[PDB]
Design a protein around this ligand. Sequence first.
Ligand SMILES: [Zn+2]
Length: 954
Amino acid sequence: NNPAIKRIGNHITKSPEDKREYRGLELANGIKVLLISDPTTDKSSAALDVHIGSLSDPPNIAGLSHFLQHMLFLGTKKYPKENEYSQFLSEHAGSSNAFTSGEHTNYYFDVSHEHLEGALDRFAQFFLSPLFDESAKDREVNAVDSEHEKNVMNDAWRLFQLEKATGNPKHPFSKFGTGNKYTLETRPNQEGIDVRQELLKFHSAYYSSNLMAVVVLGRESLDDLTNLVVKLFSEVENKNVPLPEFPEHPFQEEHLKQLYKIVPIKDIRNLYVTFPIPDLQKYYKSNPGHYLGHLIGHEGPGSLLSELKSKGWVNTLVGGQKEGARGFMFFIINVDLTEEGLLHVEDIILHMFQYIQKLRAEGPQEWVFQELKDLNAVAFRFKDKERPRGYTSKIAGILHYYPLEEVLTAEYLLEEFRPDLIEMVLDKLRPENVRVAIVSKSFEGKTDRTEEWYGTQYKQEAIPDEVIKKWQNADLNGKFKLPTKNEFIPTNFEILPLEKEATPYPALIKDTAMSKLWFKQDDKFFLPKANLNFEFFSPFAYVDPLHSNMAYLYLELLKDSLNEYAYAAELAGLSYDLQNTIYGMYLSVKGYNDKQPILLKKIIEKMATFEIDEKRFEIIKEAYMRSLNNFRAEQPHQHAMYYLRLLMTEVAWTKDELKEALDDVTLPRLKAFIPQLLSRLHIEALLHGNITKQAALGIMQMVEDTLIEHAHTKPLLPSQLVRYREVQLPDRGWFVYQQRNEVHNNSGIEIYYQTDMQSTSENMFLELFAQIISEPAFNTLRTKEQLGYIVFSGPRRANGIQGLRFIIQSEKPPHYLESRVEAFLITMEKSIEDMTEEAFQKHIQALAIRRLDKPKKLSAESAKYWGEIISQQYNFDRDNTEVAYLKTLTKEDIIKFYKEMLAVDAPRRHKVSVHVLAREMNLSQAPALPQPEVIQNMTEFKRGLPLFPLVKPH
Ligand SMILES: [Zn+2]
């Protein structure tokens, strides 16, 4: 035997398509482990999930377990340097993150495959001897505060906390999870609490081996991973902590039959219907809640949504089970509301109960369960191979819920038909346990309560007993019918033999006035799936704001019109994406290849013969007005990015321009625009997956023929295939553009140091520099100086040009943010001077692994080719070519590049800053800056600068 292993599990059931090898075990201290050997992986990975979270915070220190989560990265006894962990990962092509929910704290990393043991050693110390350094703790509490600030004016986070504030206030469910500076520092100081001791006591008490699950994925054999994991994790102490459990529901009698009226930040209108239910987790082999969700949440003919949509009351619906914690769950039905829907909330909820009554009338349906079982089995068999980092993290969470042997299958395979469970859940969906929440600006100034942590304005009322009664007597409405058999369920999974003429990259197999067709038969994944991507080029999609509006509205009305039919295809693993672009339209069809030509045909046919329903048109136009308006409530950093895009691209219509133009979109006008849009087009496509050349040629010509037949499409002239250019900033110039975010009380900044056109050498100069400064920028600007939670640095690529950008969101003013980025850039010039040759070669090597990391699934490989196609660079072998050149670079080359393009006194510095002010508006030495040119009018700024050329094709 082995003293350190309690048991090794039996065979871990996996998909027969899965070439990874697996071994489950439990250590003697109680840690549940999954080991995954993949000898092909470029990045290895591990995750650890401790089954404690938020719901176990001390009642007097809200946010503690989330604070501990941040603090664990900031040093341990064996590795006391504050960023030893992140720096180690950065220098070895790795990355890490963590999250805290009510019951789990989950930590994960990935790393270059040769450096697993080093990464994993440093990571294991988190669970053995964190330092919770006093100085780290006082700085890091600012990152958490700033994380909560970002969430404060977000509607989803406000609704999430509001639900917890209106159940039983004594129940742990009512806790505030994120915490902030108030809860984590200010108030504890006032109460004589030593937060460092609290972190140490909480870690001591709950970070117990018996509550942990570990997953490790590496090239090493299963035996080697076994020894590694025993070596590192055997020392975690078992304190035998009982798993926390919450058998009493946070919504008791007095919390039921309540109506909440809520003021949102965005102009949104929604209706939330909720019923408390028991915890159904233990019934995973039948999944009664999924069965009900699938039915109540259906979007096919005869569905609930379908009738609410025809009445013109709602556009969208989500229904089904929602997680609570060990011992309680919820079942939801939530919809968005049209203006007319807002006035018929009562009738909407009755239709919900009529639909529920139809399910009780028909009884549990074994054929529905069989369909669900069959799709889940196909989905599991042909699951795309996952990136290691998300895969270890996700399995760590679920090791707490399923036997070792079933961890891979348990969320997929259904085994038991349980009409008794289906009826038992359905018996809880009754008007006597209903909670109803309406979100709308119409409640402004009509509310009388305020939620503490977010400020949310709402009113609570009992639902009148006569309203409950009307709902309890709901009868059968003849518009509601069970869905019928889903005929998109695929049954042909044959993998076509690899053709003799198959190539490693996409090949241009059709090059005509109408269409350019890039094609590759999958030679790696061997799943019965394909991706079909199309750019439709037309100047009329973006010629003015009005047209761009009409392009959008057309495509939204089209998707709305197809929804009923397309929903079945997407339950059957066949989906599509359709949107207007600054060039035209983009269409992508992905998933099982079997029925895929059927759905594609249908989209092109509808596209080309579309008849707008006038009612759908007014509803979708009003949602779009709101959606443009609601931009004002996005975050300051999203504003800054959005303004830079408008500043640097040749053509770009603002949200304001689109909004003004929107009133002039009439039905007549939209009906005229469509044939005009479709009259002349160019189509560039990538057809990639389980498909032959001649099926690819056939699919392409079928799209052409359908357009030609129905919309009389002719080819665009080559000269009209315009790409837009980037604005060319002058040597030594600095421009600032300044605006205010009217909603958030944080500011945001984007700083862009433009370099030159993209090419091999320029790319790798910028990428290597970015790789070098990446971790230090986060360490400096966030961990040390604490300027904000959101601190970002990296390449910016647009319209064939590039440069270095910095994005920060902070309470500090933008001019101060600027000076800190500038101090930091100097700090980096010195680090680069002082770093060893070997330190320098480790960064080359890390960038190299990053760039050469193999796609693990079809759609990631398609996305690489697609980026070559849409950028018109067509450099399909870029990665080998760029990396060969990268390996040639020296320290001097990067110092010279920095001195020429980036330094404060650089001869070719080209800087633009976007300053977004907050609603209401020791340290290294910042250099003196010149006086900037303040941009007053974006159109004038553009007209007075040159425009770069466009990049040439391979
Ligand atoms: Zn956090």
